Design a protein around this ligand. Structure first.
Ligand SMILES: COc1cccc(Cn2c(C(=O)O)c(Sc3ccccc3)c3cc(Cl)ccc32)c1
Ligand SMILES: COc1cccc(Cn2c(C(=O)O)c(Sc3ccccc3)c3cc(Cl)ccc32)c1
Lengths: 258, 235
């Protein structure tokens, strides 16, 4: 069955390519300065933060807070991308609608962090679709609860990026994360795990063929999901330190994804 | 290398038997009224509890359960010594791996002594029900929910021995000095488990991943709410 595993891999990558406008390949080309196209506007200090908000578009009233809503606007945009990609996954839209919601409900945070790692090196993050680069030192230097809440994301990213996965690897990895059969409140786990079974097989082969010099990559990738679920837990906790940010209709768009 | 990987598997299993006096095989013989062993005393309520230990109750149960963690770190430590390469690692790092990896192993091995209804105590001589514990009041519910999920994998002692070695030797543990020698040991512990599951469960569909995915669920129980106070010092 090594032929349908290749065809499954490809066509998650094909849908991945169209669901997500900014890929890892493109993020690394920009980060490394590593070819033609363009250098991003760098946010290293308060004066660059304020100049970045003119030429740079921002579809999104103190400064460190103005960085939360921006990060929150953006994560909610990402949900609709992850939601579209989920639908390209063979078997997903035949699942019970309730289960589809539960898978996304719990899956989108873990996928957001995975994808946030593609835009991060140890020095900072690509923001505003590669057009910008906020430095890491500019982020530790934010106030009170804003001083961290990005810093552990970087911690995980530097470690995650060391696996040197490409977009074709991540397409399957993300699919694996969505079709996760232990989301609280799933009504029907049989097809969920039979789809995840395929994806794991497709992933195991992809890592084999794509990183043939890298012995236990499938297993080391799976261990990362234990770091992923922990980072998600302490972010949902740091957002009950940030119920202490006004809409309200924006509290009502941007409270979840969902 | 599939002779190296059988040798390693069988080495860890031997050390496992020798380190842990109550195995899962023993626990399952005791739990299912199997004949080789003797039925436990059952603690379902208050004068069962009273009659079993022949100030208050809840925190005195929490004193016992906390001390069972003591011999358990005495035993996990002894096992970790037999893991090829462990004692070669930097002294500080040996400690770092033990401190963060021990509770995840406790909960793995507590799944062996549990069913849907309760837990074995005193090397399998007693049996505390889930509801007498739910009568105190929360601290055991996640253990039981993981235990029920895990025991579905139908893992036995030879599988757990290797899987537990995989836990202890993780290079993601906060503040490891020399990460690379630790990853090197896990890599061959990883392909020894993969050979163990394909050879022991020839019919288990993608069991290897299913088991490492369960490493998530273990990490989250650990986020629960004085040789213990010195393991907890920062996590
Ligand atoms: C996984 O995709 C993303 C999810 C959330 C954010 C981002 C990039 N990004 C953005 C953005 O709006 O593009 C933002 S908001 C922003 C950036 C610069 C100036 C004002 C707002 C952001 C903030 C942090 Cl602390 C980290 C990453 C951030 C990408
Ligand atoms: C996996 O190794 C174990 C780690 C901790 C506990 C146990 C079994 N156990 C014990 C014990 O003393 O053997 C105990 S302590 C105990 C309980 C009643 C009377 C006397 C002691 C315990 C308590 C809970 Cl709430 C759950 C499991 C427990 C086993």
């Amino acid at each position: 069955e090594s032929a349908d595993l290749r065809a499954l891999a490809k066509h998650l990558y094909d849908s991945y390519i169209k669901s997500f406008p900014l890929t890892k390949a493109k993020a690394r080309a920009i980060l490394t300065g590593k070819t033609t196209d363009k250098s991003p506007f760098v946010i290293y200090d308060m004066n660059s933060l304020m100049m970045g908000e003119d030429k740079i578009k921002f579809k999104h009233k103190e400064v460190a807070i103005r960085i939360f809503q921006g990060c929150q606007f953006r994560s909610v945009e990402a949900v609709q991308e992850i939601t579209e990609y989920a639908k390209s996954i063979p078997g997903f839209v035949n699942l019970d609608l309730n289960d589809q919601v539960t898978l996304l409900k719990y899956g989108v945070h873990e996928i957001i962090y995975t994808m946030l790692a593609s835009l991060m090196n140890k020095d900072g993050v690509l923001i505003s679709e590669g057009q910008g680069f906020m430095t890491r030192e500019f982020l530790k230097s934010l106030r009170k609860p804003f001083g961290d809440f990005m810093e552990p994301k970087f911690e995980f990213a530097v470690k995650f990026n060391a696996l040197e996965l490409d977009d074709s690897d991540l397409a399957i990895f993300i699919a694996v994360i969505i079709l996760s059969g232990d989301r609280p409140g799933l009504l029907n786990v049989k097809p969920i795990e039979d789809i995840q079974d395929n994806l794991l097989q497709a992933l195991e082969l992809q890592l084999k063929l794509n990183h043939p010099e890298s012995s236990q990559l499938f297993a080391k990738l799976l261990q990362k999901m234990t770091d992923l679920r922990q980072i998600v837990t302490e972010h949902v906790q740091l957002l009950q330190v940030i119920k202490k940010s006004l809409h309200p209709l924006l509290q009502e768009i941007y409270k979840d994804l969902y």
